Structure formats: C-alpha cells, structure tokens
Amino acid sequence: AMGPGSDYIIKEKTVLLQKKDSEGFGFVLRGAKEFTPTPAFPALQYLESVDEGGVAWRAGLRMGDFLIEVNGQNVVKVGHRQVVNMIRQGGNTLMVKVVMVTRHPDMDAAAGSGSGSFPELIQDTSTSFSTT
Amino acid sequence: AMGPGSDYIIKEKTVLLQKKDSEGFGFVLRGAKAQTPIEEFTPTPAFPALQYLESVDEGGVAWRAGLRMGDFLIEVNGQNVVKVGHRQVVNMIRQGGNTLMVKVVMVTRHPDMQDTSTSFS
C-alpha cells in the first residue's frame, strides 16, 4: 500500500559453524523455555551475544539473530531446552539459518500523492569510532 | 488500551564515555545521511532516532559503559540528535574530544501470544 512507515527489514543467512571438541561455538542462546511468529519476533530462540573472534562471530553471526532452522530442522516455535538439544545432537558442526530484523524509516508518499507505493528507505551510512 | 497490541520495551540510559588518546570510543555509528527525506522524519517507538550503534567493540570504552549494538542515539553532550543527520552527529562527537556524554534508547519487542539463557562459549 501507499504511505510512509517504519518497515521491517528481514536479513536472512544460513551459516555453517565447525568447531573443535574443545571449543564452544561462541554464542549465548536465549529464548522461551500458542506462539505466532511475526516480523517483530520471528522465532523463540535468539542470540543473546556472540563472542568477538569466536567460531560463531568469525562465521558471521551477531547478537540479535533469531534462530530459524538448526541443522535443517525448523526451530521457530521450539522451546529453549529442545533447541539446545539440537545444537548438542549436532556435535562440532552446526548449520543454522538465522534472521536479523531491523526497522527502517520508509518515506514513501501518502495515498493520493500520485507517487508509487514501493519502499523509499532512508539512506544510512557508517562511521567507525573503534580503536581499530 | 486494553487487549492485544504491539509491545515495545524501551530502556533509556545516559552514560559518560571517557577515553584515552590511544582509544576510540569503541562503537560504530550508523544512521541517516543528511539528505532531503530526513526532514520528514518523526521519532516513534519502533525507530526513536536517526543514528544508532551498528556495533560496540567488546571490552572497549562504550562496551564497559554498557552500550550495545542497536542502541539509538538521543543526545550527544547535551544536544538532541534524534533528527540530526549522520555527518553532523559525527562532528558533534568529534567536537567532544576524549569525552562523550550520550543518552541512548534500546528498544526490544516481546513474543506474540519465561526466557532462559544457555552459554555456548
């Protein structure tokens, strides 16, 4: 439809993690221990944090990623213990499909403007204030 | 408003960042370039400000003050930056030198109808 808003940007990625038996994947999983997935909250388990430089980090995962599938099994509505079970049953390899959801201002014209209805997302840019 | 709705959890924090010459403040700032459609921007619960933290260096100055990825910048050294374009916010941060007072907002959503964490470190 026409009009402005805060759109949902759904950024999806399937990631392969391979670790040593002596390692962790380097993330903290958090989620619920009747649910409806939505863009605002697309799965019950998500990454609370990702160790900088660990396996998960180096393979691309980041805090806030929602877990969609674990080793090709859907985990969108699965409880915490059971999702933890699947990562356990997968051993030193984990294929995980995740989504990052962000909101993004869309300045598309309102109805009656005669303009088109596609998103007009504002242009972002980044500037590092990192030490390195 | 009784009954179901869209739930936003908003947490506001003001922190004082003080770094050495050898450090950066320890975050990456991302947000809207100062181009024409930014004049049309109104802050909302879903999107409280035009500039936000794309990342925060683990263990760095911002991190130790508790800032994290996704925090929205509301104020920089007492000046409101909610509607301000990226270069101007960057310059405001630079003008503060090795001290940055920043007020941020973190917005989170609830599942649509408790939570447990498990470490994999």
Would you write up a description of this structure?
The structure is a homodimer. Chain A is mainly β and 132 residues long. The first copy, chain A, has one domain: Roll (Pdz3 Domain). Chain A is 11% helix and 39% strand. The first copy, chain A, is built from two helices and seven strands. The N and C termini of chain A lie far apart (44 Å). At the A-B interface, strand 2, helix 2, strand 6 and strand 7 of A face strand 2, helix 2 and strand 7 of B. Chain B: This is SH3 and multiple ankyrin repeat domains protein 1. Chain B: It is found in: Cytoplasm; Synapse; Postsynaptic density. Chain B: Belongs to the SHANK family. Chain B: It comes from Rattus norvegicus.
The ordered string of helix (H) and strand (E) elements of chain A is EEEHEEHEE
Which structural class do you get from the secondary structure elements of chain A? mainly beta
Task: Give me the Rg of chain A, rounded.
Answer: 18 Å
Number of strands of chain A: 7
Q: Specify the biggest β-sheet of chain A.
A: 4 strands, antiparallel
Please work out how many helical segments of chain A DSSP would assign. Answer: 2
The oligomeric state of the chains shown is: homodimer
CATH class of chain A, anyone? Mainly Beta
The biggest chain-chain interface is:
A-B, 48 and 47 residues
Query: First CA to last CA of chain A: what distance?
Result: 44 Å
For the record, what is the CATH homologous superfamily label of chain A?
A: PDZ domain
Strands of the largest sheet of chain A, in order across it? 1-6-4-5
The total number of structural domains of chain A is 1
* Percent range of helical residues of chain A: 10-25%
**CATH-defined topology of chain A:** Pdz3 Domain
Family (chain B): Belongs to the SHANK family.
Protein name (chain B): SH3 and multiple ankyrin repeat domains protein 1
Subcellular location (chain B): Cytoplasm; Synapse; Postsynaptic density
Domain PDZ (chain B): 14-108
